[PDB]
């Protein structure tokens, strides 16, 4: 289930982080508005950019911590405030995060692994709600 999935993802986190974020950007190409330097690149070209791998992994490092500190897929309010108040999220709305978790959930469903996709779907919905409660438009 959810906790085991965190362990699974952490066991190959650079690969999963890049592949899930690539699934996100390909499913929602307009989201490149927030990542202008990734425009005009293929998946393999992004995986060769040190910035891409570093940033992707740091994002998922934090995402797994938030997931890990959650109870029953409900994130801590403190984690939600951190996500809303970090300056790199200045322009973001909850729809950006929703789309990321849609892509994540569809990635797990398309995988042949026993991911608990329904728990990640709930986690995403509860994080979006916590973000709104913490002040994200
Ligand atoms: C649970 C979900 C997320 C977590 C835990 C998270 C975390 C982070 C972290 C840790 C960084 C800084 C890492 C670094 O500077 O190398 C970062 C930067 C950033 N994040 Fe997020 N993030 C999340 C979702 C999103 C989403 C959905 C978007 C946009 C659709 C987004 C847009 C950005 C941008 C634009 C930056 C800075 C620019 C860049 O690094 O290229 N984040 N985020
Ligand atoms: C800013 C950023 C975020 C993510 N992410 O996984 O959210 C991946 C690559 C990036 O450059």
Provide the β-strand partners of residue 74.
Answer: 71
Pocket test for ligand 2, best of 34, 56, 102, 107 (most atoms within 8 A of CB): 56
Atom of ligand 2 nearest to the CA of 17: 6
Name the method of structure determination. X-ray
Tell me how many domains the chain contains: 1
What residue ranges line ligand 2, CB within 6 angstroms? 17, 21, 35, 52, 55-56, 59-60
Q: Smallest Cα–Cα separation from 101: which of 78, 71, 75?
A: 75
Residues 69 and 75: beta-carbon distance below 8 Å: yes
Torsional sign, CA 76, 108, 24, 98: negative
Rounded Cα distance between 103 and 22, Å, is: 9
Distance CA 32, CA 124 (A): 20
PDB resolution in Å: 1.8
106-114 long-range contacts, CB within 8 A, separation 24+: 106/23, 106/27, 107/19, 107/20, 107/23, 108/5, 113/8
> The CATH number of the domain where 33 resides is what?
1.10.490.10
Sign of the torsion angle spanned by Cα atoms 82, 136, 105, 40: negative
Whole-number Å distance between alpha carbons of 90 and 76: 20
Task: Tell me the C-alpha distance between 128 and 119, whole Å.
Answer: 14
Range of the domain at 71: 1-137
Question: CB of 127 within 8 A of CB of 80?
Answer: yes
Contact present, 60 and 66 (Cβ < 8 Å)? no
């Amino acid at each position: 289930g959810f906790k085991q999935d965190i362990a699974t993802l952490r066991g190959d986190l650079r690969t999963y982080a890049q592949d899930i974020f690539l699934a996100f950007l390909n499913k929602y190409p307009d989201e490149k508005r927030n990542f202008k330097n990734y425009v005009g690149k293929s998946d393999q070209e992004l995986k060769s950019m040190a910035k891409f791998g570093d940033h992707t992994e740091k994002v998922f490092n934090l995402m797994m911590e938030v997931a890990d500190r959650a109870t029953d897929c409900v994130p801590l309010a403190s984690d939600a405030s951190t996500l809303v108040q970090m300056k790199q999220h200045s322009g973001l709305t909850t729809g950006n995060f929703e789309k990321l978790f849609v892509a994540l959930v569809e990635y797990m469903r398309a995988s042949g692994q026993s991911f608990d996709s329904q728990s990640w779907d709930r986690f995403g919905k509860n994080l979006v709600s916590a973000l709104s409660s913490a002040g994200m438009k």
